Amino acid sequence: NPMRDLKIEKLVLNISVGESGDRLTRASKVLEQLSGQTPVQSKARYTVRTFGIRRNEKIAVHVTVRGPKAEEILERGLKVKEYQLRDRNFSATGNFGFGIDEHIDLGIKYDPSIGIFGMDFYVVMNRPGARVTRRKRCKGTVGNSHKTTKEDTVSWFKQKYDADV
Amino acid sequence: RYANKRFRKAQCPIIERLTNSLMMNGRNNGKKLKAVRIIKHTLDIINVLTDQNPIQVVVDAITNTGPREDTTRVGGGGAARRQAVDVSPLRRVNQAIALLTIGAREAAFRNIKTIAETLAEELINAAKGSSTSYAIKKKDELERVAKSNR
Amino acid sequence: ITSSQVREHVKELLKYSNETKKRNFLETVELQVGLKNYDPQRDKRFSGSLKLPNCPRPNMSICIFGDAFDVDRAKSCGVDAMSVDDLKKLNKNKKLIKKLSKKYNAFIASEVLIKQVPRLLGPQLSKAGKFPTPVSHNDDLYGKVTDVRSTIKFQLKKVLCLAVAVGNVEMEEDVLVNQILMSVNFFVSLLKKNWQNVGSLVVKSSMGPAFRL
RNA sequence: AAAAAUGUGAUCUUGCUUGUAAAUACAAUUUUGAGAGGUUAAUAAAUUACAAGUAGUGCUAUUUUUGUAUUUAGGUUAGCUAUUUAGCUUUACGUUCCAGGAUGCCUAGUGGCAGCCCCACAAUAUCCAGGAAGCCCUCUCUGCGGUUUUUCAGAUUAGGUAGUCGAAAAACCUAAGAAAUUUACCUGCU
RNA sequence: GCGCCGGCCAACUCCGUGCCAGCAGCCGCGGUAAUACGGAGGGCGC
RNA sequence: GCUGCAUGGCCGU
RNA sequence: UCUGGUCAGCAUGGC
RNA sequence: GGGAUGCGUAGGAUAGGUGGGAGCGCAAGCGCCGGUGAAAUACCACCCUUCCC
């Protein structure tokens, strides 16, 4: 029972692409004093016409979560811009964060996404034992039974703090 | 030239014609009043800082400022040589007065609500008691230029 | 150069010295050598002390700077003694110090005293080449005094030649030659060319004429 | 910095030559837009520090007390024109912007002012002119720049001089086939 | 009946026309108000 | 709506 | 004199 | 080789140097001494610079 219940594992915020803290190391400042940690990431994909053609990229991305830091964040997080907080918005797996997608090559990849819900929010929902699949060892796979359902997912969060819409 | 020399009414305080001329040089936009004031106030400035009577200080200044010789260009067969020549007595005054006011305006010191200190300081600096200041420089420079091309 | 040749030099020199059979006073033997193909400008010049194997015959004037014991020995020897107390006084009065330096060929000083002597004395003594030789406070001076007497200084200066006192009329020709050899040894060591540098060598008594080797 | 004392073997120091070490920065506006390529090819100035040799000078070579301190400073060796003062900018000769560092040199003083701690003025000459930008141009994306082919009758009613490349078209820029086709000053005959 | 009617050269208006069609001995005329082209009415000459 | 080269008038020079 | 400017002030031939 | 020659300052003075040196001389003088100086000088020598033969 309690096992079946859905809770949020790692969320992680993120930022847009391009260089960050261009004038001075900034934009990391936001994400700072927000969420508590300070991630930074880099990128690949050299020739960008209006992007850089830098290889190793300063590119801003970051955040993550845990338990309880993203609760008390993802608190006063959701209840931010959500014209349609949920619906079609997230999908089979449980949760999402998106907006309007573009015709781009997708699907055959690990599936990180451009998608921007908020400063592209990533609530990811998983119930269960699930640490099973992720963890290195006999990985195991999710049952596709005890898997999240969007319906269940658009529950839990909604029951608390904010309407589904 | 421009016209016949018109005689100028002498100064109300000290009935010196030369003074009025100086005042005219200062004035612009026909603000005759401000112009007279600046000169008068300067004279008062000349009195305090310097024991001497202002009228004397001014006249001496003009004397130091008047160029005796100036160079005028002329076209010779080749190139335009700058012929040195004397300067009319009338011409010398206009140059002297004009140069004083210009140099006076030149001074950094912005004293009195107006220009009045710059005039006061300029004149003293001019005197040859103190023969220095921007006004005298121009005067000395012209004379130097002349007789260079004697 | 060779021993036999010098022996002849010495022997001849003694015979030549005359006027009478011999002066009343004992003359001394001088050895003079001229050098060639050496530039005096460089540190080619020689200033050095040589201990002669058989003494000079005069036993060079020597001064001793030091305190009791060392000073006592000096007095017994009959040498001038400069006491520890005097050193500062002498530094102050250049007039006396200059005189003292001119009068004596060598100076021996208690080793501990060396800091003080150069501080005060060094300006006068050093230029001269007069700087004292240190000896332990409780050393036995006699052997040294004998050698320094029985020591002679070879000082070329900028000039090409050298004159040194080798001995006395009293000493044997063999001894004079031995002493000359010690002098020659220094030159041999100084330049790579060695003795080759010696242009000419001569021996002579005080009164007597010089004879070329 | 001043004072006193011990004292390293008294003692004492302005320099010349060789070896090693580090700064002197850089970015930006602007440029044919951007990146990459020799910001080249060249040759690297000079300031301080330690060692040795050497005239120097015997070489490394001390401790205690006192005021913030009572010290020297400041400038000076940028280019250009000029017969002097001066002036201009502020330093350029591969071209653009800028620092003056060595030695030696100058004022320690003169003039105005009631007075000054208040304003003005001197200084030779040799050393390197050094540092960054910057390089005919080339390749790529591919460039408000600018290519590729064709046609050219005829000015409210027509001509005389003529209008940025003579005009126009379509289109090319990884590709250039392909087709239509003006006017301003100014005027007329029976 | 025949030629001519812009000037030389005597005899003029309308319409058609539109650098066309045409005229022309010379100067020239016609590119939309042409006594100059073509017809018509009128006129001059013979 | 065209033609100030078909013009009046008026104006500039 | 400039085929100066204005038919867009008005007037006016022609289109 | 013989005769000349050697000018910072201080030093009675134009100190090229170095070794010997407490004397050389009837004396005068000269030196030591004293002193100045980085160095001391008579007298005996040797080594030099420049000039002459």
Curated annotation (Swiss-Prot), chain A:
Location within or outside the cell: Cytoplasm; Nucleus
PTMs per UniProt: N-terminally acetylated by acetyltransferase NatA.
Subunit-level organization: Component of the large ribosomal subunit (LSU). Mature yeast ribosomes consist of a small (40S) and a large (60S) subunit. The 40S small subunit contains 1 molecule of ribosomal RNA (18S rRNA) and 33 different proteins (encoded by 57 genes). The large 60S subunit contains 3 rRNA molecules (25S, 5.8S and 5S rRNA) and 46 different proteins (encoded by 81 genes). Component of a hexameric 5S RNP precursor complex, composed of 5S RNA, RRS1, RPF2, RPL5, RPL11A/RPL11B and SYO1; this complex acts as a precursor for ribosome assembly.
Xref: SUPFAM superfamilies: RL5-like (SSF55282)
Keywords: Acetylation, Cytoplasm, Methylation, Nucleus, Ribonucleoprotein, Ribosomal protein, RNA-binding, rRNA-binding
Main location: cytoplasm
Source organism of the structure: Saccharomyces cerevisiae (strain ATCC 204508 / S288c)
PROSITE patterns assigned: RIBOSOMAL_L5
Extra facts: Present with 21200 molecules/cell in log phase SD medium. There are 2 genes for uL5 in yeast.
InterPro entries: Ribosomal_uL5 (IPR002132), Ribosomal_uL5_C (IPR031309), Ribosomal_uL5_CS (IPR020929), Ribosomal_uL5_dom_sf (IPR022803), Ribosomal_uL5_N (IPR031310)
Domain of life: Eukaryota
GO cellular component term of the entry, any: cytosol
Residues annotated with N6,N6,N6-trimethyllysine modification: 69
Coiled coil: none
Gene Ontology BP annotations: cytoplasmic translation; ribosomal large subunit assembly; translation
Family label: Belongs to the universal ribosomal protein uL5 family.
Entry protein name: Large ribosomal subunit protein uL5B
Pfam families associated with the record: Ribosomal_L5, Ribosomal_L5_C
GO molecular function: RNA binding; rRNA binding; structural constituent of ribosome
UniProtKB/Swiss-Prot annotation, chain B:
A GO cellular component annotation in the UniProt record: cytosolic small ribosomal subunit
Glycyl lysine isopeptide (Lys-Gly) (interchain with G-Cter in ubiquitin) crosslink residues: 128
Compartmental location: Cytoplasm
Modifications the protein undergoes after translation, according to the UniProt entry: N-terminally acetylated by acetyltransferase NatA.
Methyltransferase is among the record's keywords: no
GO MF term list: mRNA binding; rRNA binding; structural constituent of ribosome
Keyword Cell wall biogenesis/degradation: no
BP term (GO), one: cytoplasmic translation
Record keywords, A-Z: Acetylation, Cytoplasm, Isopeptide bond, Phosphoprotein, Ribonucleoprotein, Ribosomal protein, Ubl conjugation
Primary site of residence: cytoplasm
Physiological role: Component of the ribosome, a large ribonucleoprotein complex responsible for the synthesis of proteins in the cell. The small ribosomal subunit (SSU) binds messenger RNAs (mRNAs) and translates the encoded message by selecting cognate aminoacyl-transfer RNA (tRNA) molecules. The large subunit (LSU) contains the ribosomal catalytic site termed the peptidyl transferase center (PTC), which catalyzes the formation of peptide bonds, thereby polymerizing the amino acids delivered by tRNAs into a polypeptide chain.
UniProt similarity note: Belongs to the universal ribosomal protein uS7 family.
Quaternary structure and partners: Component of the small ribosomal subunit (SSU). Mature yeast ribosomes consist of a small (40S) and a large (60S) subunit. The 40S small subunit contains 1 molecule of ribosomal RNA (18S rRNA) and 33 different proteins (encoded by 57 genes). The large 60S subunit contains 3 rRNA molecules (25S, 5.8S and 5S rRNA) and 46 different proteins (encoded by 81 genes).
Protein name: Small ribosomal subunit protein uS7
Source species of the chain: Saccharomyces cerevisiae (strain ATCC 204508 / S288c)
Gene designation: RPS5
Residue range from the parent sequence: 76 to 225 of 225
UniProtKB/Swiss-Prot annotation, chain C:
Modified residues (N6-methyllysine): 44
Name of this chain's protein: Large ribosomal subunit protein uL1A
Function: Component of the ribosome, a large ribonucleoprotein complex responsible for the synthesis of proteins in the cell. The small ribosomal subunit (SSU) binds messenger RNAs (mRNAs) and translates the encoded message by selecting cognate aminoacyl-transfer RNA (tRNA) molecules. The large subunit (LSU) contains the ribosomal catalytic site termed the peptidyl transferase center (PTC), which catalyzes the formation of peptide bonds, thereby polymerizing the amino acids delivered by tRNAs into a polypeptide chain.
Keyword terms: Acetylation, Cytoplasm, Methylation, Phosphoprotein, Ribonucleoprotein, Ribosomal protein
Post-translational modification summary for this protein: N-terminally acetylated by acetyltransferase NatA.
GO MF assignments: RNA binding; structural constituent of ribosome
Domain of life: Eukaryota
Pfam families named among the record's database cross-references: Ribosomal_L1 (PF00687)
Subunit structure, as described in the record: Component of the large ribosomal subunit (LSU). Mature yeast ribosomes consist of a small (40S) and a large (60S) subunit. The 40S small subunit contains 1 molecule of ribosomal RNA (18S rRNA) and 33 different proteins (encoded by 57 genes). The large 60S subunit contains 3 rRNA molecules (25S, 5.8S and 5S rRNA) and 46 different proteins (encoded by 81 genes). uL1 forms part of the L1 stalk.
Family affiliation: Belongs to the universal ribosomal protein uL1 family.
Subcellular location: Cytoplasm
Sites bearing Phosphoserine, chain numbering: 76, 83
CC per GO annotation: cytosol; cytosolic large ribosomal subunit
